[PDB]
Amino acid sequence: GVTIVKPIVYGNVARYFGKKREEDGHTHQWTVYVKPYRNEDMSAYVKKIQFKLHESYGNPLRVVTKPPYEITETGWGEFEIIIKIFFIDPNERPVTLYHLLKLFQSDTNAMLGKKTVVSEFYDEMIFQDPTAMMQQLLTTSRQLTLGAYKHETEFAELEVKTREKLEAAKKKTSFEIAELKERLKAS
Amino acid sequence: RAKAKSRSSRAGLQFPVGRVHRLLRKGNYAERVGAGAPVYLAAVLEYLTAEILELAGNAARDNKKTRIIPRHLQLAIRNDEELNKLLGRVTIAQGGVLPNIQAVLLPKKTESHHKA
Amino acid sequence: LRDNIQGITKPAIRRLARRGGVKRISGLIYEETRGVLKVFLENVIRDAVTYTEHAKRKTVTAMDVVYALKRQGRTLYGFGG
Amino acid sequence: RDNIQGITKPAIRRLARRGGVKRISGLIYEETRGVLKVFLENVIRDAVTYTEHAKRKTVTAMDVVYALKRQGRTLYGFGG
Amino acid sequence: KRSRKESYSVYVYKVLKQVHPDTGISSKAMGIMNSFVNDIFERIAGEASRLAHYNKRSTITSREIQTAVRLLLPGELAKHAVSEGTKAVTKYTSSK
Amino acid sequence: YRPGTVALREIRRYQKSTELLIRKLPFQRLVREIAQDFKTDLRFQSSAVMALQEACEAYLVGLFEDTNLCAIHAKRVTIMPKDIQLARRIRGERA
DNA sequence: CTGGAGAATCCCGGTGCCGAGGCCGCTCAATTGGTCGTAGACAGCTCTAGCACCGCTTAAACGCACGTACGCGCTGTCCCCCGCGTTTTAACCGCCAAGGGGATTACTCCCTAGTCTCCAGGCACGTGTCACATATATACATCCTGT
Numbered sequence: 001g002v003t004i005v006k007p008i009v010y011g012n013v014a015r016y017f018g019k020k021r022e023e024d025g026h027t028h029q030w031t032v033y034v035k036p037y038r039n040e041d042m043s044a045y046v047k048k049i050q051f052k053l054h055e056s057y058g059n060p061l062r063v064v065t066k067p068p069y070e071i072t073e074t075g076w077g078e079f080e081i082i083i084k085i086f087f088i089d090p091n092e093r094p095v096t097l098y099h100l101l102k103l104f105q106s107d108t109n110a111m112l113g114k115k116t117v118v119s120e121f122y123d124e125m126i127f128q129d130p131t132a133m134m135q136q137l138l139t140t141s142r143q144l145t146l147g148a149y150k151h152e153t154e155f156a157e158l159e160v161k162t163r164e165k166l167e168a169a170k171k172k173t174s175f176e177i178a179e180l181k182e183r184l185k186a187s
Numbered sequence: 188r189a190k191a192k193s194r195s196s197r198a199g200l201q202f203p204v205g206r207v208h209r210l211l212r213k214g215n216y217a218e219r220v221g222a223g224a225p226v227y228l229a230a231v232l233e234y235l236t237a238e239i240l241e242l243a244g245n246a247a248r249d250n251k252k253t254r255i256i257p258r259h260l261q262l263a264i265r266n267d268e269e270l271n272k273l274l275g276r277v278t279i280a281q282g283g284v285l286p287n288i289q290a291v292l293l294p295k296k297t298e299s300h301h302k303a
Numbered sequence: 304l305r306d307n308i309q310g311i312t313k314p315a316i317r318r319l320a321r322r323g324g325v326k327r328i329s330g331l332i333y334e335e336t337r338g339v340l341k342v343f344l345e346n347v348i349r350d351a352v353t354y355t356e357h358a359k360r361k362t363v364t365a366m367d368v369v370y371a372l373k374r375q376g377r378t379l380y381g382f383g384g
Numbered sequence: 385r386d387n388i389q390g391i392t393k394p395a396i397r398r399l400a401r402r403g404g405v406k407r408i409s410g411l412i413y414e415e416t417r418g419v420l421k422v423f424l425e426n427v428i429r430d431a432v433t434y435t436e437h438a439k440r441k442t443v444t445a446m447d448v449v450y451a452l453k454r455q456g457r458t459l460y461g462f463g464g
Numbered sequence: 465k466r467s468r469k470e471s472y473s474v475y476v477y478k479v480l481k482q483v484h485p486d487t488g489i490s491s492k493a494m495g496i497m498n499s500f501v502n503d504i505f506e507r508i509a510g511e512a513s514r515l516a517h518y519n520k521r522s523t524i525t526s527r528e529i530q531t532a533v534r535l536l537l538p539g540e541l542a543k544h545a546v547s548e549g550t551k552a553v554t555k556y557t558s559s560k
Numbered sequence: 561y562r563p564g565t566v567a568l569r570e571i572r573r574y575q576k577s578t579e580l581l582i583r584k585l586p587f588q589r590l591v592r593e594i595a596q597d598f599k600t601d602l603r604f605q606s607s608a609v610m611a612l613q614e615a616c617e618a619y620l621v622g623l624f625e626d627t628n629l630c631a632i633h634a635k636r637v638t639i640m641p642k643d644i645q646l647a648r649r650i651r652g653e654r655a
Numbered sequence: 656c657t658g659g660a661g662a663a664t665c666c667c668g669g670t671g672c673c674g675a676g677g678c679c680g681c682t683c684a685a686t687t688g689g690t691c692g693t694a695g696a697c698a699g700c701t702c703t704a705g706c707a708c709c710g711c712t713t714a715a716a717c718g719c720a721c722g723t724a725c726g727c728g729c730t731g732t733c734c735c736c737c738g739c740g741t742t743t744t745a746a747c748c749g750c751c752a753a754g755g756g757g758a759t760t761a762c763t764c765c766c767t768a769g770t771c772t773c774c775a776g777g778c779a780c781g782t783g784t785c786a787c788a789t790a791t792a793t794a795c796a797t798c799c800t801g802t
Contacts, residue, residue, distance in 0.1 A: 022719050068306070074718090191776070195475075198556040201482070202475040202501070203778090210505070216513040216524060219768060223526025226556055227549035228508050231533050232501055234548045236476055237483050238541075239500065243493070244484040255480075255489040257381070258578050260496055269541040277503070278372075278618040279496055280381025280611065284322060284625075286575030292568055296561055304593040310586025312716055318581040319617065320639070321574045323624025325631075326567055327638040327725080335644045336620065342653075343619055344594050347612060352598040362603035362705075363595070368611045377619065380499035381492065382611045384469055410736070430535060437531040438519055441757065450518065454535070465701085468779050523768085562723040583715090603705055637725065 004127045004138045006045075007037035009151050010083060011120020014103045026074040028103040028117075032081055033070035037122065037151070041067050041144045045087055045137040052082040067144050078103055085125070089134040095125055109156050118155040194226065202236070204229045242267060257281040308341055347371050391417055427451045472498045508532050526553060563637075580613055587613050623647060 014030035021027070034049050036042050049069045051062040062071045083097040102119040109117075127138060152158050194204040208225035211217075242263035243255045250259065261282035264270045316336045320328050348363075350371030355363050365382040372379045396416045400408050430451030435443045445462050452459045476497050480489050489497070511532035512524045521528075526549075533545050574581065588609050595602050623644065630643035648654045 023721090024719070188774080191774090193777080194556075197560065198552040200552060201479045202472065206470070206778095207505070211509060211524070214509065216509045217516060218522040221523050221525035221528075222768075223553055223556075224512065224524045224529045226553055227526050227529040227533070228505065228512075230549040230552040231508065231529075231537075231545040232504055233475070233479060234545050235504060236497060236501060237479050239497070240476070240480045240489075241483055243489075244480075244487040247487055253486075253488055255487065255493040257492060257496060260493060261578075269538050272538045273536075273541070274500075276376050277378045277380060277500075278615060280379065280614045281492065281578050282618075283578035284324075284575055284621055287324070287568075287572055289569050289572035292565060296565055304589065304596065307586070307589040307593040310590050311582060312586075314716055315582045316620075318570070318574050319620045320624045320628075321567070321570045322581065323621045323628060324571065324575075325624050325628045325639055326571070327563055329638050329640050331641045332639055332644065335641045336623075339623065339644065339648065340616055340620060341590075341594070344591065344612070344616060347615065348591065348594045349598060351608070352595060352602065355602075356599060361601070362605060363608050365605050365607040365611050368608045368615075372611070372615050377615055378503060379611055379615050379618075380496045380503070381614065382607050383495060383499035383502055384471060407736075433531060433535055434515075434518070437515060437527070444758095446518075466780080470779070474778060563725065564723090605704075635726095640726095 002129060002135060004130060004135065006042075006125040006127070006138065008034060008042070008123050008125060009037050009120050009153075010034040010097055010099055010123060011118065011153070012081075012099065012101055013152075014101075014117040015115060016103075016117075020076075021074075024074075026076050028076070029072070029074045030101060030103055030117075031070050031072040032083075032099065032101065033068070033120075034083060034085070034097075035067075035069060035149075036144070037149070039143050039145060039149045040141045042069070042141075043067050044141040045089075045134065046085060047088045048086045050084045050086070052084070054079045075101070075103065087134065088137060089131055091131055092127070092134050097123065112156065114156060114159060116152075116155055118152045120151060120153050122153075195229070198226050198230065200226070200229050200233050202229045202233045207232075239263060239270065242270070258283060308337055311337055311340065346375065350374055388417055388421055391420060427455065427457075430454050471495075472501050476501070507536055511536055581617060582613060584609075584613070587616075626651075 010033070012030050012032040014028045016028050017026070019027075032051055043066050046069075047065075049064050051064075051071055053060040053062065053073065054075075057073070064071065078101050081099045081101050083099060085095040085097070087094065099121070100119075102117060105114070105117055127134065130138065194208075195201065198204060204225050207229045208220065211220045211225055211228075239260070240255075243259045246259040246262045246266075247253065247255050252259070257279050258281075261279050262285070264274050264277070264279070265285055313333055316333050317328055319336070320332070347368065348371075351363050351367045354367040354370055358367075366384075369379055369382055393413050396413050397408060399416075400412075427448065428451070431443050431447045434447040434450055435441075438447075446464070449459055449462050449464050453464070471494075473494050476494060477489065480487070508529060509524075512528040515531055516522070516524050516528045530546055530549060533549065534542050536542070537545055588604075591604065591609055591612055592602075595604070624639070626647040627639045627643045630646050631637065631639040634643075645654075
């Protein structure tokens with residue numbers, strides 16, 4: 001009768017090189033990742049997360065161990081990445097996630113000239129009737145970082161949300177300086 | 188009282204026999220240090236320092252420098268057969284290993300006349 | 304943290320090998336070098352923090368690192384004062 | 385005297401067999417003899433120094449134990 | 465309220481100048497030389513202490529230090545240090 | 561050129577000079593991350609970090625020398641992982 | 656790939672030899688009880704680094720492209736270690752004198768060394784300059800332009 005929910009967020013960010021590789025054939029540097037929504041260390045209950053990429057790569061099955069869980073790799077096309085989350089408790093069934101590697105922008109986002117592509121989805125790992133050890137591990141998770149934790153799902157809108165404040169404050173300071181100090185010098 | 192004479196001057200050593208004996212008596216190395224132990228220790232320290240300084244100055248003069256630097260100390264320690272045996276485990280900050288000569292590149296391969 | 308062991312890039316390991324007389328370096332040598340340097344730093348910093356905590360101090364002094372290296376047989380001159 | 389040949393070919397062969405070796409080169413014996421001679425010379429020099437310091441005429445086993453301890457070869461079974 | 469720390473820079477620069485009048489030494493080279501001095505000090509002291517302890521002796525004497533110098537310094541380096549120490553002891557007891 | 565030139569000149573140069581081959585800033589973050597696992601909110605004196613870097617560089621130079629020797633042992637000029645592995649095993653670090 | 660031998664192990668039970676264990680009897684060394692200066696611990700106080708940034712500059716790390724050079728496998732064949740049987744020899748004895756060579760114990764004794772003073776001079780610290788590095792007038796010095 002014990003149910004513990006661990007919210008997570010998985011996805012990938014991609015950056016366009018601006019030109020296709022000379023002889024390789026890659027166009028975007030992308031980083032698939034799995035990270036928690038709440039500021040907590042997932043490794044307290046996660047043993048390893050495997051990322052099975054396309055067979056075209058030398059090693060399709062990547063692995064990570066610690067709270068980040070990101071592999072940086074370059075590619076040329078979009079494909080489905082199978083993410084399998086293994087827990088410390090071997091009696092707990094691993095969780096399998098399916099994420100579509102997104103590298104290209106939509107026409108609307110392309111017209112905006114934004115360089116970074118982002119696609120991560122909100123998810124929750126439901127542990128129904130977990131073992132005593134797994135329950136303790138889930139309940140004893142510590143905080144990961146001292147700062148805040150954020151997500152840029154789409155980014156198209158988060159960039160505008162950030163700019164509306166950043167550029168506003170920057171322009172206000174620039175004006176307060178230029179309009180006032182020149183007249184102060186005039187006096 | 189009579190003009191006090193230090194123990195470094197009596198024996199004829201530059202390093203401090205007094206400070207040596209001081210570190211020894213309250214260093215817990217023994218219960219009652221002998222009067223001659225510190226003299227001998229300071230003498231050996233002085234001899235080793237003089238030797239390494241001679242070698243470092245020789246290396247500096249060979250390198251056309253006036254101020255001794257970790258480079259010279261490392262070179263001197265690794266060139267001498269016995270000092271390297273004594274200081275094999277030691278590492279020195281801002282030091283370096285003995286280098287190799289690049290003259291071997293010239294009579295094997297260099298840039299050709301192609302678009303020179 | 305943000306995978307700081309990767310802060311030792313290929314040029315640095317290549318320079319270290321050059322100084323060590325190495326003539327040519329393989330591709331996988333860099334991972335082995337980062338893993339060996341990591342293991343060495345682990346022991347050194349463990350000894351240093353053991354000397355520090357015992358002193359009830361919040362700062363890892365240079366003398367702590369010197370004593371740690373001296374325990375490993377890696378006596379280091381230059382920071383004795 | 386020159387009795388360093390007391391460490392004969394079969395002795396070195398057995399010492400190597402104990403070390404996992406199954407095939408030894410011909411020139412291995414004259415090198416092993418020199419290595420063992422140097423190791424001895426060193427340990428025996430240390431032991432003789434320890435003995436002369438004690439004003440004793442006999443090189444006790446504990447002196448050999450200390451000499452080995454100096455070289456890092458701590459030998460248990462003889463006193464320390 | 466001063467927190468003074470000691471060093472051998474005073475006896476090493478003197479030794480340097482007496483053996484190399486024209487050649488100086490940098491501050492970091494001086495620190496390295498002081499570290500070497502302290503390391504050899506510790507080595508000789510520990511060796512003499514252990515040697516005295518082996519003979520059930522509670523006092524480190526000049527003989528213990530002499531044998532420790534014989535043991536530590538390798539090949540044709542010990543002899544010179546032993547001779548210097550003996551000549552300094554003989555000139556020290558002679559009240560000169 | 562090819563495998564035979566600039567490596568030798570780089571050897572000569574980096575052996576003549578004695579500057580720190582590893583960058584200070586990236587190595588400091590590595591040291592702090594390694595220390596994190598022992599004591600939270602730990603401070604390090606600059607000289608301590610410099611000494612750590614010097615010791616690490618010296619150890620790595622010695623390891624690469626022993627590894628260059630292992631590579632030459634097998635009639636090879638390139639140092640492979642098994643070379644470093646053998647150097648460490650005979651050293652007694654990972655026997 | 657089995658047979659078919661054929662040695663090598665290796666169960667497995669047996670049997671005295673002698674080290675392992677135990678018990679006894681003192682000796683000595685850890686405990687007890689109590690006094691007595693330190694050790695260091697802890698409560699402040701100071702101010703030195705340590706950390707944390709931020710900006711500008713650019714070396715440098717880095718990815719890519721592109722051969723060449725070195726790595727690995729293959730092959731041939733040809734020396735030099737292995738396996739094993741014979742002659743050699745050194746390593747065990749045993750012998751036959753008659754006594755010491757040297758660690759070990761012990762007792763005076765006595766120089767040497769701790770302890771504990773008071774001092775004063777010699778070595779950490781503050782300050783005075785001088786060798787090398789830095790940034791800027793300058794007297795021409797090379798294109799550009801009236802002419």
